[PDB]
Chain length 509, copies 4
């Protein structure tokens, strides 16, 4: 009954997947823990099985990765760059079949699955460039015969914990950067996207092995909260990059702080789009559509709040309503399909709980609000009006496709309402006013890590640093100088002279 044993899913073998797969890789493949079955959210059928990590597996893998680090850290960065380049090429080769696997096991539509892999490809190109550039400044010493320099060195082992909704790209951002920086990696992905984790690890393993490098440089330990907790408490994990819920993320941050580790937290969002009276509505409506119903509203960057100026409120809602009705629903791998299933059954229940609660708090469902009567975890993408900006149900990160719509009049109040939530990931305004754009980007504007103008809250490119503020956790990934989070800084002063002048002109003699 496994999908992978059915003739139409034979393409899965192009990723090297079988009926039962090893979920631990450290140079060798294994897995002595529990076997998990993952399911297609589009039809609730079992795909294939993964043998997860046991305690012994985790312990062995950590030790092997750290031993592999002794070799990898000695390889010059541009040569490490060359490995990441080849990973980039290996992804390019598999991009359609890997994207199809993401569509099958996670449930996002094919163009987004392929697009997610493209993020990994892109950050590989960026990292290759970085491998020739990373480092610090030579600074002028105030002391004669001294050099003052900033050195950057790998932290060691980077633990990477990722979530179900971007089962490839987030690992990719971390992997590519942490690698060229001289670190080894240990991946624990979402249990419900284990096959994706295995498939990606198979691609990377072959590059490492083909370059006669130890596989444990990019290690994999599939597991649940037991493995993630072990990572958060493990002093041998020098940096823990965690992407997931705010609730879990807070505890991960506390555990890592308790051992004076380093953490990179990428947590939830409650992101807002704001449409001012002068906004190009031809930009607003498709932007809101993509930001809200993209990935069935299961992105951390998904727009969950839509603020519309009172003068254009009804008109925007009407046009958004017509747009929602023209969304093509189907199997996420099927063509021209723009809307797939939610990732889990539990998610469908929450969607129901939130829609009913929204009704109870005074809100009006102007579109959707119901489960689709069809196989899979399909719900109607939903629009709710009439609620206040401070309504409890709207201050609740539900990973459901529900968009809460609010009226506003003044710029000052609506900027405040953007900022009033606990999360601080993404935000966007739609406007032409020059001054307003300046204020939005300034000290009294958005408090988020991503601050956009005339585009959705979702769909970042890799060139900038990605992450948010407040309860979103403060970590940054991907571009700009996010690489510094994966390295340790040292301020080095070298005396090349025969004298000992002291800083600040202190005479100690």
């Amino acid at each position: 009954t496994l999908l992978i044993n059915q003739p139409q899913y034979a393409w899965l073998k192009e990723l090297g997947l079988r009926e039962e797969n090893e979920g631990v890789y450290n140079g060798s493949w294994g897995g002595r823990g529990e076997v998990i079955t993952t399911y297609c959210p589009a039809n609730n059928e079992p795909i294939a099985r993964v043998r997860q990590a046991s305690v012994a597996d985790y312990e062995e893998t950590v030790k092997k990765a750290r031993e592999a680090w002794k070799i990898w850290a000695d390889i010059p960065a541009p040569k490490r760059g060359e490995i990441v380049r080849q990973i980039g090429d290996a992804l390019r080769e598999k991009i359609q079949v890997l994207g199809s696997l993401v569509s099958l096991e996670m449930g996002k539509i094919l163009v987004e699955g392929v697009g997610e892999v493209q993020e990994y490809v892109d950050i590989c190109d960026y990292a290759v460039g970085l491998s020739r550039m990373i480092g610090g400044p030579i600074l002028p010493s105030e002391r004669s015969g001294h050099a003052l320099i900033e050195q950057w060195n790998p932290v060691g082992l980077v633990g990477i914990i990722t979530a179900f909704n971007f089962p490839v790209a987030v690992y990719g951002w971390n992997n590519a950067i942490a690698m060229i920086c001289g670190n080894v990696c240990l991946w624990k992905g979402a249990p419900t996207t284990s096959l994706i984790s295995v498939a990606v690890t198979k691609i990377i393993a072959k590059v490492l092995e083909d370059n006669k490098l130890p596989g444990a440089i990019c290690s994999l330990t599939c597991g649940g909260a037991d493995i993630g907790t072990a990572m958060a408490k493990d002093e041998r994990v020098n940096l823990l990059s965690f992407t997931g819920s705010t609730q879990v993320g807070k505890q991960v941050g506390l555990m890592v702080q308790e051992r004076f580790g380093r953490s990179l937290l990428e947590l939830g969002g409650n992101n807002a789009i704001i449409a001012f009276e002068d906004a190009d509505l031809s930009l607003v409506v498709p932007s809101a559509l993509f930001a809200a119903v993209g990935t069935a509203g299961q992105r951390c960057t998904t727009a969950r709040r839509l603020f519309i100026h009172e003068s254009i409120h009804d008109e925007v809602v009407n046009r958004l309503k017509k747009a929602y009705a023209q969304i093509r629903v189907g199997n996420p791998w099927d063509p021209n399909v723009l809307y797939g299933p939610l990732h889990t059954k539990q998610a469908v229940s929450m969607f129901l709980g939130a829609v009913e609660e929204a009704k109870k708090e005074g809100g009006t469902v102007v579109y959707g609000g119901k489960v689709m009567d069809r196989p899979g975890n399909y719900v109607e993408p939903t629009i709710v009006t009439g609620l206040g900006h401070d309504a409890s149900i709207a201050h609740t990160e539900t990973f459901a496709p529900i968009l809460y719509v609010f009226k506003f009049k003044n710029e000052e109040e609506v900027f405040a309402w953007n900022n009033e939530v606990k999360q601080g990931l993404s935000s966007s305004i739609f406007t032409k006013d020059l001054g307003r754009i300046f204020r939005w980007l300034g000290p009294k504007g958005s408090d988020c890590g991503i601050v956009n103008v005339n585009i959705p809250t979702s769909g970042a490119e890799i060139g900038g640093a990605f992450g948010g503020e407040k309860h979103t956790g403060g970590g940054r990934e991907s571009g700009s100088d996010a690489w510094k989070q994966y390295m340790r800084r040292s301020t080095c002063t070298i005396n090349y002279s025969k004298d000992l002048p002291l800083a600040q002109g202190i005479k100690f003699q």
Copy 2:
């Protein structure tokens, strides 16, 4: 009985100090908390009194500072820099009396008191430069008609908690940088250096007043653990910069993380100097001396471990013993003096405890090891040989002037020994070998935040980022791009076109 009431201490009035001083400043001066009396560690005589903050004082001050921020953050960064430039000049004007107050209340020698103020003057210079430079790159977008830019904005209120041993400079690092970045500051210093905190705050308050700015931009709430804990738990403190013990700092870090705040931790060090066989011994010996006994061994950057290659161990120890015997002890304001008192009687007690335990663990005191028979908190600077690199007593952070001396044979083992401690602040090797210096500065070398060659572990200049790794806490202050810790990064994409191309070429 108060020193400030005696005529040979009348210079204290040049800093605006009196018999009883207000320890809360937020634009106005006050303090409803307990009155603390601070003592001169060189004679144990009371200097003057400071009325500390009550928790209600702190609450009012936080609110006023946040209101002031709304004004301050609207002032262009180069204009904020002009203010910091004037603080710089105001410090320059009072550098001698303020340095003398540092020597009187904290106990460090006058050249170090003055030198510490000079660090604040230096970072002011640096920050004035920064006020014209801070920002992020404009990046090329993969999308037609889009701009991709990185913006930096202030975090808001920066809480600053500092320790007794550097009562001016650490605040200064944080103040100058936080200010040009558009933040407001709230300072809680060490209770036993309250007068110094008040004196520094008076200097800054006058500059703010003269420039018609709200005083709460640089607020002061003198207090102890109750105020520090309030700051650690206060969601309105956007960034908490904490310098202090690893024990307290760990809890501070947890409290801040619990509320998803930002922290910058600057905690303890157990810093080593390593002298290889090819070392210039004429550099080794005075560097060890300065690193170990400067500030009477009370810096977080103090050399506490000295590894010496077998072949030169006895010669270096013998020369260091002769150098220690030439150290001139006395009142720290007497400018012929190189060595003053420990900051507290408690430090003396801990010193004696550590010396006794070192001996019980098999160490030999080859110099010092005893209290001095004079008023105040004086102990002999002390050298202990004979211990193994992993002796328990050498792995306890003792803020006292005891230098533990170890032998080694090979580079691999002694780099490991440098790295085996919980802290990771400063480290230094003395050698001429190129390959060794490369390895020391590389991925298999020192694991510390400060990695030096042929100089002490102490005495950084302000141009680089300052801080450590591991149990030192990971925070960075002062130079390089440390300013980024005082700001929030946003990645901003602006669509100037009439189209909506999506990232990664996705067709939706």
Copy 3:
């Protein structure tokens, strides 16, 4: 006779000036060349005299500066910064009287004279910061046991030739930055602003001598074309910074290239302001006024061309005409005066030539166009309409207050019209349109070094690099990383190992 001998002007003594002043400083004050008398352009009365350099003085000064360099380059950059900090303070103390001298000898109004000195103070503050920051990256080598670093070192002697129109600030830009970079400087200012050069050099000299530094670190050699030419041909002048006419600048650039020297050319502008239909006219009119008549139109950044969209052309010209009528003319040191004389009588003659040529090319003088009947070198600020955008006189830079006004309809053509001149210094558009601002700043927009939006062409701040493209010469001064032009880059590879791996994996064995 001499103004410095009259009690109305006794404040000149505060700058250390006398009836006859030495125009050479190299540690000693001297001058064996011809004695020049400078005149106040407001009344054509002699101010004071200056003994200029002989070529022998020049020779001696170059040699003493290069000797001073051996000491100065050994001073750590942050300590050179402390010297520049003190120069900044010395300028602050004299800012009113030095500003007044600029007004007296050069002819610009008092607020502009003081402002020019303020630029020097600002760049001193900036330079003090730079003195702790200058240097280059440590890069990762592709080779084991190798370090790859970028070093920056002083070029040695920086010759600085400045023009009459900014007799303090341009030297200041060059001086503050060259000094912290570890260079010595040799200044030849405009002969007609000799007193200003002397006054500035006296301020700097006191700081150097008080610090027991060799005075030739900031040498002065007052003189004319003969000294300037010697500097251009002298191999011992490692960098020649030239600010002046494009005609002279080309020859200077050619003389420096012929000896493989370094040059930094800051030449003429033919700067345009463009007002679109959606422009805020309350910003346009006072911006055009300042940009056109500030410094009596004697800035290289002066607006000389004003393009106005057809719909608002007549309105703007009428409103500009009204603002011109309210300009207050008189002695520039008078605190109520808004408009002073041209710097020389030759400039009056050139003004007259250009106005008559504009009429002969078909232009209409709608305001001004006449020499004023009063002592000194005053002319009416002038507005000319009706010329074609490519009229010869409009494509000519005349250093006089003449503003040529053009009509346009579409953006593509007027962007081309901005770019069609030989010069490329400054440019400005007034508009609110988002897309148009993007294009203006982009590859098909303005070709100038300074590209402004909703402000005049003139009045840069110091934080950014200052300079232009095309016939403006290509040099950059002041902010950003302009400091690199005063230093030589070395790319340095250091082998710390016992092996010799070759770049690109070449095996030569």
Copy 4:
């Protein structure tokens, strides 16, 4: 049968798309109405194939087509331009052995160097791809409320690239990869005697451009001699001219470009010294001197031409270098394990013999070599000359021949001055262990060269840093660090988002 390309053993040439007669002009179309040149193999003096060069009209049409193509190319976002350069990188990767072999055949350098040269191109492509997501400038804090101050970078337009015989692939590649991601179009004129290499490289690039539906004139080719080169130097439509070649020609190129206020990047000759101090590791000194001197048969601009050895070790080093020279394997340069090939031309052989005779005429002792080799092709013995003084005239004439001049020295100060005393300033190396000395070498009183090395040869740079020299070497930089800024124009841009007009320096007008 006479042409090598018509002989079966060289059939591999047709893998590069070469034939008996080739078109030497590419601008989207292939052509060439100019003189037909035949290039010869220097290893056997046999003709290889023919190339039809550009006429005047060809150059004229190509410049116009390139500048038309730029309108399309400059509008393509930098990261997408990077994707094109990435594909060029891949295409070179696939042809690297056969292209390297062609370099050995037509230019004469040995196979590992030919392949290594192509590897430099591949490496800079990887770097440029990274840069394509990074290039730009800082947002700076304005001193004025409601204003933004930013630095923009935009392409200059058409970049002319003139390259030399000795690096017929890599120099073009540095310029091409970087110029492309910066949004420029390029026009290449190579050495006539390496025309087939130019055509081969262009065929590889043209396929990538055409496959990507881009106008081929983006990377144009106009093979020709001095008439084409002079045209480019005088052509105002060439916005940036990058010239690699002799110093004498270079100065004339720089003068011509300055005369029209264009931009030039000059990469001219070197007279590079290695300095060995008494404490040097001689096991590094001897092979470094061997590679630096005899690699490329001494025909690099970075070739070590002067070897200074401390008096205490001079005889030992010379003796050891003699023995090393005798171990050099000579043969056909496209043969693997051959380490020494022919000079590029018969004229170079004559000039070699002349320089050797003059060296003896100046009192020099030939301790090794000095003679033509008894075999076909342009082979000479790599040569060592001792006994001369550092200022001997023959050691200050840049001969592209394998003659190493060896000097004695005693003191650090004198030998640093001797390094610096020549007119060129390209590369330099010291061999020492002394910390102070290395500090001094890299400092303001040390080497005056653009490349300043420690314990490695003068030649063999990696692409991560900027490449170029000082003084008569011309001042240009190519490849790494921020050399890309030479290919772009900087603008300092101020945007007023407010309704007010505060002026810089607080001027009230």
